[PDB]
């Protein structure tokens, strides 16, 4: 006889619109949260941006990386994720839907894709997936999770179809063995989204878990396969949770070696793979690289490492100077130079005996006390190689400065074995 | 005669009248249904597990006149781990069913006793072999087989399980719809499919099973279909509770407390935690105390009003 009713709770509190409150570094990727239909939230600065550009130094580095891979015999397929705003604007509430300049953001996103294409990169055109309006039969299969930054598996599959179109038109795909695959629903996942968590602690509220289908891809006498000739480098977006590499195998029709891992960001997965012996003994014909507009494309310490690695660091090569030392806490002088060691012709290769070393903090000493302080950090979300490879600095006048010494900061306590070689670069050969 | 057993059922079912001494008089007087009556006394007073040896004596005496004792003996032998006596009993039961002396449903109930994990170590393979031999003459046992294979995947894959459910869904047993709903709900022998779950659970709930209501309530509460549906969750959980599922009440108290997309309402959570106390748990009373300390006296009084108005569920 008595009636008991229940209500859906909790529009974003007005206090989350206050940019003052996103103080920590983590919170800064969410500034600011806005409420949309259902419990869709959006981050204004990252999801609703209209600008997809980098600096000229960035474009020059991207061009060099393309050309260096090409000399190693690798073609690159750039998967440049369109934003949550670009794809799911139609879930916005009317006010934000009318303030978001989708035509400008669409044009600038397409322009950055064309820029990538201009440097030689193979660029699958993902703009047709923006302005998503799902068919009635696909009502719940949104490109993005409502309160999280990752695509759903359905978003990944849709991107994979276009990527496979690009790969089939590629001359490098010739000679790559073909293989059939079968992809099936395998289970269900529940996502507590990052946006919902940040919202929840800003407003003292609570969000429902969003459930989503998981998928799995299986290969369907001498029918076993050799080594992959396509490699996928990427972030958490390419991890097991969303089956991006499964869908790529399914629609390309070929094996795909997946070396992504969460927390790798723009360069972690790439740096770890380039240092690997898999890449140096079985370099792929096609490397698919997955990232998004979230990452600055003008960090010089990233590309000095990627370019050093594309030249194979310092091995199979005469050393100019070498060190085999036990670091102690404090400053440790590994090498002291006579010979005219010109920054623009040099690279450093540093391996720690202990593979758990994630940080290299060091100083390159030049004439009259001019010094470069370097700090290279490996991701803490994957087993990494304890190896740091980097070209000397070449911007401004640095390219001509002569190298005098190299020192390395020791551990807070204990001792650590390290080996360091200084060598000349070759021109990205074998 | 059907005389002493209904009379004992009367003397126990409403003690407005000793019963053990009346059974002892009927036994000392040598009336053959005395032992069945005292077994009934054991079951109703909750002492059955304390007198298993005498249950065996009585039913082994009465077995050839009272086939329900086939179920009783089996229970004893499952409780006390007696595989030898169980083999002998099942041999005489297969014989009796061959001779036409025992109906197929009695075989079905014995098989379901053999697979009752709550009795000790089960004999699920023997259960399957009995059910498969009486299923052609007793279609309900198809569903029994479907459930057996479900609890014991050892004995059959999902294709085998579905063959059983189809042979039984010819009789369109509502239990079959309930089993399909649970199969798509629980994601145990198959990947979970919330839509197929919802469909088969809806079929089951329209046909009788209030437990389908519990599952539908949980389904709308969590949002496995993609969205939480608060009112549907409340309605279906409430129907389950009003039908005799205790876990429903606690569920509702959780629903009105935890947020997670449903607006917390402390008073109604209170009502349902109190209802959940019928079979209390630590978590039950702990939620009840937190909620109670969260309310004001006027809120508490209005909540007591709904509580009393809901215990006014005639339900008979
Ligand atoms: Cl039973
Ligand atoms: Ni090219
Ligand atoms: Ni194609
Ligand atoms: Ni993840
Ligand atoms: Ni300094
Ligand atoms: Ni109730
Ligand atoms: Ni919670």
Author numbering:
A (entry chain A): 29 to 248, 256 to 372, 378 to 470
B (entry chain B): 138 to 154, 159 to 457
Wording from the paper:
Alginate is produced by a synthase-dependent exopolysaccharide secretion system—a conserved molecular mechanism in Gram-negative bacteria for manufacturing and exporting carbohydrate polymers, including cellulose, acetylated cellulose, poly-ß-d-N-acetylglucosamine (PNAG), Pel, and alginate. Synthase-dependent systems are characterized by a membrane-embedded glycosyl transferase involved in polymer synthesis, a cyclic-di-GMP binding protein that regulates polymer synthesis, one or more periplasmic polymer-modifying enzymes, an outer membrane-linked protein with a tetratricopeptide repeat (TPR)-containing domain, and a ß-barrel porin through which the polymer is exported. In this study, we focus on the alginate proteins AlgX and AlgK involved in polymer acetylation and export, respectively. The AlgKX protein complex reveals the molecular details of a crucial protein–protein interaction involved in alginate production and provides fundamental insight into how a polymer modification enzyme and export protein function collaboratively in synthase-dependent secretion systems.
To understand how AlgK and AlgX interact at a molecular level, we co-crystallized Pseudomonas putida AlgK without its native signal sequence (AlgKPp33–484) and full-length P. putida AlgX (AlgXPp1–479) and determined the structure of the AlgKXPp complex to 2.5 Å resolution. The AlgKXPp complex crystallized in space group I 4 2 2 with a single copy of AlgKPp and AlgXPp in the asymmetric unit. In the AlgKXPp complex, we were able to model eight TPR motifs (R3-R10) in AlgKPp (residues 138–452) and residues 29–468 of AlgXPp. The N-terminus of AlgXPp (residues 29–37) adopts an extended conformation in the complexed structure that could not be modeled in the isolated AlgXPa structure, suggesting that the extended N-terminus of AlgX may be disordered and dynamic in nature, thus requiring interaction with AlgK for stabilization. The AlgKXPp structure reveals that it’s mainly the N-terminus of AlgXPp (residues 30–37) that interacts with TPRs R9-R10 of AlgKPp, however additional residues outside the N-terminus of AlgXPp also interact with AlgKPp. PISA also calculated the interaction interface to have a buried surface area of 1015 Å2 mediated by 12 hydrogen bonds and one salt bridge. The side chains of AlgXPp E35 and AlgKPp R404 form a salt bridge, while the main chains of these residues interact via hydrogen bonding. To understand how specificity might be conferred, we next examined the surface hydrophobicity of AlgKXPp, AlgKXPa, and AlgKXPs. This analysis revealed a highly conserved, hydrophobic patch on the N-terminus of AlgX that is buried in a conserved, deep hydrophobic groove on AlgK. Examining the surface electrostatic properties of AlgKXPp, we discovered an electropositive region spanning 44 Å across the surface of AlgKXPp that extends from the active site of AlgXPp to the concave surface of AlgKPp, from R9 towards the N-terminus.
